[PDB]
């Protein structure tokens, strides 16, 4: 997971007002990755390898 944002909630308001507003809530994101592979191959000649 990752917390992208927290958002804004609440504000200072005039006392005479009798209600309040809705803010803009934050955002959360789901992320994922991957794993990679390394490979190779090599070959020999038996007699040459044995006599070297």
């Amino acid at each position: 997971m990752k917390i992208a944002d927290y958002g804004q909630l609440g504000e200072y308001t005039c006392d005479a007002k009798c209600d309040a507003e809705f803010g803009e809530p934050g955002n959360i994101r789901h992320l994922e990755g991957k794993t990679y592979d390394y490979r190779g191959v090599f070959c020999f000649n038996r007699k040459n390898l044995q006599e070297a």
Partner: protein, 45 residues
């Protein structure tokens, strides 16, 4: 590392204990001849 791509230094040949010699020496007639012993550079008879 194929043997056909690297230098000869990586392979040491087997050392054999034999030698080839075709030379000859003919038989001698020396023992037929008469033998004489001297101790000076000249002689008389």
């Amino acid at each position: 590392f194929e043997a056909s791509t690297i230098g000869p230094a990586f392979f040491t040949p087997q050392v054999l204990a034999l030698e080839v010699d075709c030379n000859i020496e003919c038989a001698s007639l020396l023992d037929l001849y008469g033998q004489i012993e001297v101790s000076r550079s000249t002689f008389t008879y």
